[PDB]
Amino acid sequence: ARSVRHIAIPAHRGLITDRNGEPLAVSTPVTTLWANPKELMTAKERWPQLAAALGQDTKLFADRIEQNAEREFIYLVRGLTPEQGEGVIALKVPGVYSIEEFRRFYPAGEVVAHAVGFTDVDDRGREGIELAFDEWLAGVPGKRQVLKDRRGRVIKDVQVTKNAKPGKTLALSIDLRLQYLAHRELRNALLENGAKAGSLVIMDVKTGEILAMTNQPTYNPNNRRNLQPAAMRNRAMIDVFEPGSTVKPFSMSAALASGRWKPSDIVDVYPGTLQIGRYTIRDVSRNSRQLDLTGILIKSSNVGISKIAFDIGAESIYSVMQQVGLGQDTGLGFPGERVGNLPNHRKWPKAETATLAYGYGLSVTAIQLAHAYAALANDGKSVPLSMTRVDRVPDGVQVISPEVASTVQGMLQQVVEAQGGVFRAQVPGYHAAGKSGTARKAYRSLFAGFAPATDPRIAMVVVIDEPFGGLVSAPVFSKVMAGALRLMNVPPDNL
Ligand SMILES: [Cl-]
Ligand SMILES: [Cl-]
Ligand SMILES: [Cl-]
């Protein structure tokens, strides 16, 4: 009696590197021992020795084999070293066989854990890039057709072995050097402030490339035995929050594009509150009367952006926020990535208009906020997001007019640089631009910005759990932007 089995030959999984060729996921040959239980069952006297070699409990091992006595294949140990494998084969236990497999290892470990993600016990991607690019990376298994007896041993092949085709190499957009910098500074900020979680995204505003994307807590993908759910969250891509004051720049972009506001136009925000029906809008800083558009950003005046929003209508604000991708499906095709929500109310009442304009009327991810700021930095042109290295840059879409984008860039440079501004976000050597806010989901300190002002190269978002924006997250923007700019050999623009 017979059977014909088709056997899959494992294909070498494609190498993942960072944009510079540094190894992030490597399929490395391992020896895994498997057994044909029908054969093993004829050599029970060998089991205890086999089990000792496997460092396995004799009872559990024996039970597992008896449990599987009618199967022709089970694994004994996977991902051993060649040496260790041969140690066991030398035992010459009937029904024990060795095969070359490929096991994934992650050389950068926790540093790029969430972005790279990892594979299953079957070498199929299950988080991050490994998941998103599985087909590119996996290649195609080879096939043997094997004639087997009822033991069931291989009698012969019944056709030519069809060799596996290796997966393809993949270079990420991530620059491991920037990734590491962001990773460490985020972590220090958390430790200092007694906060539990945070994210940090760095984008190339010219190419759409995600140069860094780090979250805390994080985890070691090479050892996932004591994992906790909170550590596995790729927060940059899956935590959503109301961005608050960080989207005022997009509200201002609508104001400018409306034809009705110039940067130097004034709004009276005294006495720092504004009664809307039953509701009261309140500024945190309430020592202002007249503020120009830049002053509204500096003071984070909710009252101010609200009065502007009442003037230009929420539709225009919605349109800018949508075009820059806030709450939109600019997804890179990572299963599970969040889109957030930018409700198209179509007609907004005062309350909703105001709440949208000062950023508590939408939810976004850190990645969208970074991409939005990248378009702004890129003279209003949005280059499509990428987590893989971009050699041929796609044409951008003009989502904010170049003139409005340049104008808002200048205002944001002032919130960082001007008196009463977010001085802690200043980056020595460069003109930096950006905006603080308090995100809500539970509050988080936010800072979002880009640099250098004169020919922006990167956009960055810092999100930190708050047990304020300009106090907690701003100094992190400063330090990380200071490092990243220099890592990219960006010439200092403060001359
Ligand atoms: Cl593991
Ligand atoms: Cl959630
Ligand atoms: Cl490309």
CA-CA distances (angstroms) from residue 359 to 53, 242, 252, 306? 62, 6, 12, 10
CATH value at residue 149: 3.90.1310.10
Residues 130 and 244 in one domain: no
Ligand closest to the CA atom of residue 441: 2
Q: Ligand 2 centroid to 442 CA: how many Å?
A: 13
Residue partners of 109: CB distance under 8 A and separation at least 6: 220, 221, 222
Calculate how far, in angstroms, residue 465's C-alpha sits from the geometric centre of ligand 3.
36
Approach to solving: X-ray
Closest of 79, 113, 109, 77 to residue 93, by C-alpha: 77
- In a shared domain, residues 63 and 11: yes
Residue ranges making up the domain that contains 428: 174-220+418-495
Tell whether 327 and 425 lie within a shared domain.
Answer: no
Q: Token pair of 347, please?
A: 């007609």
* Residue whose C-alpha is closest to residue 458's, from 439, 440, 472, 477: 477
The answer to whether residues 308 and 261 touch, using CB atoms and an 8 Å cutoff, is: yes
Q: Which of 145, 101, 111 is nearest to 13 (CA)?
A: 101
309 lies in the same domain as 432 = no
The reply to whether 229 falls in a domain is no
Helix, strand, coil % in the chain, rounded to nearest 5: 35, 25, 40
| Ligand 3 centroid from CA 451, angstroms | 24
Q: How far is the CA of 108 from the centre of ligand 1 (A)?
A: 15
Q: How far is the CA of 225 from the centre of ligand 1 (A)?
A: 5
For 67, list phi and psi in degrees, rounded to 5. -55, -25
The CATH number assigned to the domain holding 473 equals: 3.30.450.330
CA distance 374 to 370: 6
* Within a domain: 225: no
Q: How far is ligand 2, taken at its centre, from the CA of residue 233, in Å?
A: 10
- Under 8 Å between Cβ of 203 and 213: no
Residues 336 and 445 in one domain: no
Q: Which of 245, 386, 473, 478 is catalytic?
A: 245
471 three-state secondary structure: helix
* Whether 436 is catalytic: no
CA–CA separation, 12 and 165 (whole Å): 8
Helical spans, DSSP H, in 19-112: 37-40, 47-53, 58-66, 82-89
Residue 144 and residue 82 in one domain: yes
Closest ligand to Cα 224: 1
- Single out the residue of 207, 236, 195 nearest to residue 386, CA to CA: 207
CA of 120 relative to ligand 1 center, distance in Å:
9
Nearest 5°: the CA angle 14, 18, 20 is 115
Q: What distance lies between CA 194 and its chain's CA centroid?
A: 23
Q: Which ligand is nearest to the CA of 239?
A: 2
Number of domains in the chain: 3
- Residue 408: name the closest of 427, 431, 435, 428 by CA: 435
On whether both 62 and 146 belong to a single domain, the answer is yes
Resolution (Å) of this entry: 2.0
Of the listed ligands, the closest to the CA of 390 is 3
